[PDB]
Every structure is written in C-alpha cells, then in structure tokens.
Amino acid sequence: DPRLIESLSQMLSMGFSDEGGWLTRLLQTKNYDIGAALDTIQY
Amino acid sequence: DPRLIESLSQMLSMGFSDEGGWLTRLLQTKNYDIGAALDTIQY
C-alpha cells in the first residue's frame, strides 16, 4: 500500500513514532491523509 | 481502568478526539502519562 507507506514514512520523518500502533490507528481512521492526522493531533 | 477514563477525559478537554481509538492506544502505550503522550504527539 503506497499510501500507508508514504503517509507513515513521512510522519516518522517528522519525528512521530508508532508505539503500540497509535499512529497507524490514527492514519487508518484518517484514510492515510497526513493533513487530517496532523489536524487531529493539533500539530 | 479509571486511569484511562481520567486521562482520556483530560485529553478530550484539550480538543483531542479519540476517533478510531488512536488516543486510547497512545495513552495505553504511555501508561496514562499525559506529559509523555503530549511529548509523543509533539504538542
């Protein structure tokens, strides 16, 4: 899935981690859209 | 676990939703430590 890959990879490069899959959960909920995930975490 | 309830409630009051359980997941990995959760999301 190039969008899991690129969304998660871009957010790891921004310094987020994925302990316990929290960030994978967030991105899945947000359809792998980085902007929506950033909004949700109030970045 | 009352620590999950209480920490989720405090996070919701800060404007964080828990859509899809991402915030529950984050708080669980952090043992309900709000400082640590905020650090992880770079708040």
How does this structure look, described?
The structure is a homodimer of 43-residue chains. Chain A is an all-alpha fold and 43 residues long. Chain A has one domain. In chain A, 63% of the residues lie in helices and 0% in strands. Chain A has helices spanning 2-13, 22-29, 34-40. The first copy, chain A, is globular and about 25 Å long. Chains A, B: It is found in: Cytoplasmic vesicle, Autophagosome; Preautophagosomal structure; Cytoplasm, Cytosol; Nucleus, PML body.
Q: What order do the helices and strands come in, and which of them pair?
A:
The structure is a homodimer of 43-residue chains.
Chain A: H1 2-13, H2 22-29, H3 34-40
PDB class: protein binding
Keywords: Ubiquitin, Autophagy, protein binding
Assembly: dimeric
What letter string, H or E per element, gives the SSE order of chain A? HHH
Strand content of chain A: under 5%
Total discrete domains of chain A: 1
CA radius of gyration of chain A is 9 Å
Summarize, please.
The structure is a homodimer of 43-residue chains. By secondary structure, chain A is mainly α.
Features:
homodimer, 43 residues, mainly alpha, 3 helices, globular, Sequestosome-1 (chains A, B)
